[PDB]
């Protein structure tokens, strides 16, 4: 092990980074070395054992804990460690396989006092808390002091409180920092390897930042130079953390600006982040990771400024002058506790341990922790979302500003956050899921897998199914297209993807840390956000699509003055709030998804849309058959699938839907009149908020077109097909087509549409995210494209590419003529397909497809 291991150390040091943690195989070999240590290797072997092994239920941890338990029990011996030392080290693995040996040690007069100190600061006790109470009740004195210790919150009070004065050096990034900037798509493969992945942070050049190697390595040396001023760094920007939920963005920042975690290799916590505006998902990820995120005016903060931050006072001052630079308020006072605990998650878990111990010993109620603020007189009614969250909490409704913990009915996970989520789950010592349903897809890496992705394909499914989750297969297609067909109406959920925007019920997307917690405990912490109401009125004009309406939201918000495009001092009524939509209650559920999905680009924390029962009834009747069919096909964890089917059947039998009260409170109400939308609306190159009417950008030359995000359904493809079929010959553009699911692909194939795409010269990609994410295939450098995908951030679909977001029907026209069409032209082409609109926009209903029902009829409920 040793020789190969330090060759690795050297390879990595040459590149300036830490070595990867030991794996199970290496840990096993290490065990042998500890039993018979070669001369002169004592200190190395001890460091590897102590600092270079993942904690929790990682496979290497299993091996490490087993070895140590044996040492502590005399069952094994090493000249380098004593039983006392083994117990001490066991107390450093935070949870999982180290707890049993630690509890057993309480029955040993020698080790007990040490085991007790270790358990006293162990948070991940979960059900093991009872094992400890039982020993105390049987007369164990050391068990008693552990209980009292938990009861007194020693684990919390022994941690340094948040200082009153923080002196930090400003690392300032002007404009908007989205998570792609911090953690680029093409580098998604290295996310689980924190130190390596961090090298890509801000690798693309932008104002005031100097990448050590443009397009490959970020401003590591610029960062290092700033660290020499003697103060810790703070990340500072006008708009921070918009876009993708990838925790890797946070991991990277903290790797450079955070603090080490004792005995946990290659992962950092803490830190400070300041932005004019901070996207809600990013904010959560930062607080869960132990950082302190603060929304404040940053115009007076400059690259390299040394600064004094006073959390309790809410002031930022120049360090040399004492001048006031800005003032602020923490979003909640509980943040102070979160930082002290090392993050919101550890806080919740630890606080619950103390509470549990306080009730066992018959004590009052802790006064050590800050409580969430109280909400005033509960006179008025509730909005749809407030009722949904309320019901998930056993109450009629939850008010904005309140802290709550909704039950998680559905949890989604995809393959680019999956590996991180899996790691976070290991850190939380999770061996089984408590959420009602956890589904894992393989949509982001299936088309052009790297070797590491292949390992992901062969390993993540089991990790998920063994915990009771449902797993799809590479080639099945996009997460949301499947996940949405597994949802229960009016319920609450989350997912490791920013586009987890349930078209029925409500979801609050999150980073891998919180997704792990929600999967494991079946619950999610939530500071209830405010809502913004968007109301559609009237009838759609000719040739207008649902997608145009999605884009009209930012458009009208800009007209009314609730949204601005300029990044400095950006205004955005939607940021951090729940977007609630009404006015289109008869939309098919997948149509509803187009609107709810796009709430992500609004920077909304979540979304609801009011729908009638019929379209949901149709959807569920179709989904029941799909799920039975999945069982017949052999899919991941049958029991979970079966229970979900029953849940759907129960609802169909008594179809009830929640509804907003007429007197609900909203932060703002936006009315949009469909009669005023006469021409298609696009999102102009590189900003999802920059909505413009077709007439404003008509004539722009187009190189490449992309059709097929989770924003599309089979109807969009039929539409594009009919348009292409009408104008035979090869296209002047490069057209990419990517059906969201294999069910979609198969039906289009059966209907003859692949011949149509084939003759046109189009590329048909396998079911999955394809170009939408930009992590595998990419558009040509500097190309101008029109895309039905969700995000046109700089460098996403391609390097230096300019991307217009539009509807599928408009995109098909553009692909045909090589440029954005004029409103008149657009209407001429589409008029043609409207004649057969009934045939074109037929949705997939699995209960009407024999190949599906036949397999469903063959299933016996276990
Ligand atoms: O990178 C990821 O796997 C997270 C995503 C995908 C993306 O950025 O489209 C998200 O939260 O949306
Ligand atoms: S990345 Fe995939 S999940 Fe949807 S938003 Fe794009 S197709």
From Swiss-Prot:
Binds 1 [4Fe-4S] cluster per subunit. Signal peptide: none annotated. Pathway: Organic acid metabolism; propanoate degradation; Carbohydrate metabolism; tricarboxylic acid cycle; isocitrate from oxaloacetate: step 2/2. GO terms for biological process: glyoxylate cycle; propionate catabolic process, 2-methylcitrate cycle; regulation of translation; tricarboxylic acid cycle. It comes from the Bacteria. Keywords: 4Fe-4S, Iron, Iron-sulfur, Lyase, Metal-binding, RNA-binding, Tricarboxylic acid cycle. [4Fe-4S] cluster binds at residues 710, 769, 772. GO terms for molecular function: 2-methylisocitrate dehydratase activity; 4 iron, 4 sulfur cluster binding; aconitate hydratase activity; metal ion binding; mRNA 3'-UTR binding; mRNA binding. Substrate binds at residues 191, 244-246, 414-416, 498, 791, 796. GO terms for cellular component: cytosol. It is an enzyme of class 4 (lyase). It catalyses: citrate = D-threo-isocitrate; (2S,3R)-3-hydroxybutane-1,2,3-tricarboxylate = 2-methyl-cis-aconitate + H2O. Optimum pH is 7.4. Belongs to the aconitase/IPM isomerase family. AcnB is sensitive to oxidation in vivo. This is Aconitate hydratase B. It comes from Escherichia coli (strain K12). The lineage of its organism: Bacteria, Pseudomonadati, Pseudomonadota, Gammaproteobacteria, Enterobacterales. The gene is acnB.
């Amino acid at each position: 092990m040793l020789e190969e291991y330090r060759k690795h150390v050297a390879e990595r040091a040459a590149e300036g980074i830490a070595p990867k943690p030991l794996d199970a195989n290496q840990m096993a070999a290490l065990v042998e070395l500890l039993k018979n240590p070669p001369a002169g290797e004592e200190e190395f072997l001890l460091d590897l054992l102590t600092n270079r092994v993942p904690p929790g239920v990682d496979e290497a941890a299993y091996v490490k804990a087993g070895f140590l338990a044996a040492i502590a029990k005399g069952e094994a011996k090493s000249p380098l460690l004593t039983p006392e030392k083994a117990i001490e080290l066991l107390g450093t693995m935070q949870g999982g396989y180290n707890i049993h040996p630690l509890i057993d040690a309480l029955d040993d007069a020698k080790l007990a006092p040490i085991a007790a100190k270790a358990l006293s600061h162990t948070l991940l006790m979960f059900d093991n808390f009872y094992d400890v109470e039982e020993k105390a009740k049987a007369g164990n004195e050391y068990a008693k002091q552990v209980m009292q210790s938990w009861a007194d919150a020693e684990w919390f009070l022994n941690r340094p409180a948040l200082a009153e004065k923080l002196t930090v050096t400003v690392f300032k990034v002007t404009g908007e920092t989205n998570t792609d900037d911090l953690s680029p798509a093409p580098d998604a493969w290295s996310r689980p390897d924190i130190p390596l992945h961090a090298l890509a942070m801000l690798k693309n050049a932008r104002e005031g930042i100097e990448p050590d190697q443009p397009g490959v390595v970020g401003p590591i040396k610029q960062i290092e130079a700033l660290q020499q001023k003697g103060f810790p760094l703070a990340y500072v920007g006008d708009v921070v953390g918009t876009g993708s939920s990838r925790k890797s963005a946070t991991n990277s920042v903290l790797w450079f600006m955070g603090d080490d975690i004792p005995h946990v290799p290659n992962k950092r916590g803490g830190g400070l982040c300041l932005g004019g505006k901070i996207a809600p998902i990013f904010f959560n990820t930062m607080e869960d990771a132990g950082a302190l995120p603060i929304e404040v005016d940053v115009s007076n903060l400059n690259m390299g400024d040394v600064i004094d931050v006073y959390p309790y006072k809410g002031e930022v001052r120049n360090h040399e002058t004492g001048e006031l630079l800005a003032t602020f308020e923490l979003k909640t006072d509980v943040l102070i506790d979160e930082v002290r605990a090392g993050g919101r998650i550890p806080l919740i878990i630890g606080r619950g341990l103390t509470t549990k111990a306080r009730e066992a010993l018959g004590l009052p109620h802790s006064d050590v922790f800050r409580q969430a603020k109280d909400v005033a007189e509960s006179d008025r009614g509730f909005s749809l979302a407030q009722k949904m969250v309320g019901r998930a909490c056993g109450v009629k409704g939850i008010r904005p500003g309140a802290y709550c913990e909704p039950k998680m009915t559905s949890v989604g996970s995809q393959d680019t956050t999956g590996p991180m989520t899996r790691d976070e789950l290991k850190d939380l010592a999770c061996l089984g899921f408590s959420a009602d349903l956890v589904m894992q897809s393989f949509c982001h890496t299936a088309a052009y897998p790297k070797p590491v992705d292949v390992n992901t394909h062969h390993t993540l499914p089991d990790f998920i199914m063994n915990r009771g989750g449902v797993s799809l297969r590479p080639g099945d297609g996009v997460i949301h297209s499947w996940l949405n067909r597994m949802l229960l109406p009016d319920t609450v959920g989350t997912g490791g993807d920013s586009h987890t925007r349930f078209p029925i019920g409500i979801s609050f997307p999150a980073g891998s840390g919180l997704v792990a917690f929600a999967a494991a405990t079946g619950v999610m912490p939530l500071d209830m956000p405010e809502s913004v109401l968007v109301r559609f009125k009237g009838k759609m004009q000719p040739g207008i699509t649902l997608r145009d309406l999605v884009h009209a939201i930012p458009l009208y918000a800009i007209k009314q003055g609730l949204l601005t495009v300029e990044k400095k001092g950006k205004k955005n009524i939607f940021s951090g709030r729940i977007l609630e939509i009404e006015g289109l209650p008869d939309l098919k559920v997948e149509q509803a998804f187009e609107l709810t999905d796009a709430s992500a680009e609004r920077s909304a924390a979540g979304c609801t849309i009011k729908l009638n029962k019929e379209p949901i009834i149709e959807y569920l009747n179709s989904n029941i058959v799909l799920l039975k069919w999945m069982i017949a096909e052999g899919y991941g964890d049958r029991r979970t699938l079966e229970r979900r089917i029953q849940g759907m059947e129960k609802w169909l039998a008594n179809p009830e839907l929640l509804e907003a009260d007429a007197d609900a409170e909203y932060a703002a109400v936006i009315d949009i009149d469909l009669a005023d939308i006469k021409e298609p609306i696009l999102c102009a190159p590189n900003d999802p908020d920059d909505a413009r009417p077709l007439s404003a950008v008509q004539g722009e030359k187009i190189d490449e077109v992309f059709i097929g995000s989770c924003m599309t359904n089979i109807g969009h493809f039929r539409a594009a097909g009919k348009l292409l079929d009408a104008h035979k010959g090869q296209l002047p553009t490069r057209l990419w087509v990517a059906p969201p699911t294999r069910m979609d692909a198969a039906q289009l194939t059966e209907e003859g549409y692949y011949s149509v795409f084939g003759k046109s010269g189009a590329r048909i990609e396998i079911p999955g995210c394809s170009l939408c994410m930009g992590n595998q295939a990419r558009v040509a450098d500097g190309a101008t494209v029109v895309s039905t995908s969700t995000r046109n951030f700089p460098n996403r679909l391609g390097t230096g590419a300019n991307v217009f977001l539009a509807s599928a029907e408009l995109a098909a026209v553009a692909a045909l003529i090589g440029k954005l069409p004029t409103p008149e032209e657009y209407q001429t082409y589409v008029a043609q397909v409207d004649k057969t609109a009934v045939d074109t926009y037929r949705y997939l209903n699995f209960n009407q497809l024999s190949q599906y029902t036949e397999k469903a009829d063959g299933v016996i409920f276990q």
